[PDB]
């Protein structure tokens, strides 16, 4: 896991290990990558993308915190006019004077504590550290890095953008965070660990304007 | 191009959204269901169709005295050949 | 062309309702480009008649009102080009 | 950037081969099966399939009997 423990807190350590049992970190990473690749396949034609290549990731890449690699690679069939590195929420981005053919995409999961739960800053720092670094190998200098804070359920990306990419990734991240199975499983595990539950709406008492449903296929009883 | 502005736009706008269409067929069976695909002839392959038609009990008395009843049957996946289509209709 | 979806459907037990109301339940063997449907292990109920078992049938493609496919069909890998 | 300008209707949905909408729990079940490389047991597969056909039989559809017996 990519969770860092400052101090040996055995209670918290066992709780977290139980929460993340069965390679949940890697399962989440895999799920996110597949969802993004699927959405890209869906909007391929509209975004003028030749193909989506699932970069062959190293098995221990999900929690490889010190370095990184590329996860998805978009083959263009053309040359896109790309933008300067801007936040995923940066509604105004200036175009860089360069064009590319391969557009790579990296996913980084984090467990941010109170001090450092700023996903935007983390994404910026990691993108400009890994791209410039000697140990991190990327296919092209042009690409995007997307950081997801699990502990706070936050999302944001920083790298370059070509037309359509920014809105597409914005909505795709929205829907992924809303309905990813691995994320849902982690959320439910955390809820179980905290024994914190949500409540219910009683159910509308049958009124004269609601009795009409009594004669549907579902079998109903009056006591 | 003009695949999406012709009169088959009722079908290619209903297969994109996967909404249900009502089809009055030629033998006056009514097909309610979602278009999985269509073509030039409106050969619509459909999923989850309610086929609703009318009957009478056809002189069960012997004196030809009965009222028409609404019958329907469910079909899971069908390939409706599109000559028998009279009208396809997107839902309100 | 959607008929090309049907000729990918070799060896499926489908029923076919025709324009004469006759329901034909059998394993489809061949489709033309004009939907000329050749069937085997045929249980044909001509309507207003009792159903007849026949070993082979060949419906002309014009006279098909509709098909009825079973539950277990993977059409998302069948209607691709 | 001079964006294109449109509404991308993104839908993320998990479906079984038969085309039924998949609940997230069994979606992750299938994901984990494919991930580890080993599926469920024969008994569990049989139970699951019998449940599916039970749902189908129930959905595809004694007052007269009680009236006659009264």
């Amino acid at each position: 896991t990519g969770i860092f423990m400052h101090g040996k807190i055995p209670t918290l350590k066992i709780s977290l290990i139980q929460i993340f049992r069965a390679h949940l970190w890697q399962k989440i990473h895999e799920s996110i990558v597949m969802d993004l690749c699927q959405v890209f396949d869906q909007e391929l034609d509209a975004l003028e993308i030749e193909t989506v290549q699932k970069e062959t990731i190293h098995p221990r890449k999900s929690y490889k915190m010190n370095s990184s690699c590329a996860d998805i690679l978009l083959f263009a069939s053309y040359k896109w006019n790309v933008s300067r590195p801007s936040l995923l929420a940066d509604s105004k981005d200036v175009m860089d004077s360069t064009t590319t053919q391969k557009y790579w995409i990296d996913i980084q999961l984090r467990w941010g504590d109170y001090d450092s739960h700023d996903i935007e800053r983390y994404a910026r720092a990691k993108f400009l550290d890994y791209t410039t670094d000697n140990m991190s190998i990327y296919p092209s200098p042009t690409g995007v890095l997307i950081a997801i804070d699990l502990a706070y359920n936050l999302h944001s990306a920083y790298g370059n953008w070509f037309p359509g990419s920014k809105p597409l990734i914005q909505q795709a991240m929205a829907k992924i965070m809303k309905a990813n199975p691995a994320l849902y499983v982690l959320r439910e595990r955390i809820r179980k660990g905290l024994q914190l539950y949500s409540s219910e709406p009683t159910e509308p008492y049958l009124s004269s304007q609601n009795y009409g449903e009594l004669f549907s296929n579902q079998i109903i009883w009056f006591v | 191009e003009e695949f999406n502005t012709g009169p088959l736009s009722v079908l290619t706008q209903s297969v994109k959204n996967n909404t249900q269409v009502l089809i009055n067929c030629r033998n006056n069976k009514k097909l309610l269901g979602r278009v999985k695909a269509f073509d030039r002839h409106c050969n619509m392959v459909l999923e989850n169709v309610k086929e609703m038609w009318t009957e009478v009990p056809k002189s069960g008395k012997g004196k030809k005295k009965s009222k028409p009843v609404n019958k329907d049957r469910y079909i899971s996946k069908m390939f409706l050949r599109g000559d028998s289509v009279i009208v396809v209709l997107r839902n309100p | 062309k959607l008929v090309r979806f049907l000729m990918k459907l070799s060896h499926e037990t489908v029923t076919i309702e025709l324009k004469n109301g006759t329901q034909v339940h059998g394993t489809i063997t061949g489709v033309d480009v004009s939907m000329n449907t050749h069937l085997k292990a045929v249980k044909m109920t001509l309507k207003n008649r009792e159903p007849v078992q026949l070993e082979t049938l060949s419906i002309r493609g014009n006279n098909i009102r509709y098909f009825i496919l079973p539950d277990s069909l993977p059409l998302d890998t069948l209607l691709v080009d | 950037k001079e964006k294109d300008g449109y509404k991308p209707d993104v839908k993320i949905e998990y479906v079984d081969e038969t085309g039924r909408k998949l609940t997230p729990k069994e979606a992750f079940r299938q994901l984990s099966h494919r991930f580890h490389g080993k599926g469920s047991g024969k008994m569990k597969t049989e139970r699951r399939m019998k449940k599916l056909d039970e749902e189908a039989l129930l959905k595809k559809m004694l007052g007269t009997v009680a009236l006659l017996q009264e």
Partner: peptide, 21 residues
């Protein structure tokens, strides 16, 4: 329409450390 998700394998592969396609 929709298609069953195509996930990769990590454990008990007998293959190279890197992913297949």
């Amino acid at each position: 329409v929709s298609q069953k998700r195509k996930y990769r394998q990590y454990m008990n592969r007998k293959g190279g450390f890197n992913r297949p396609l």
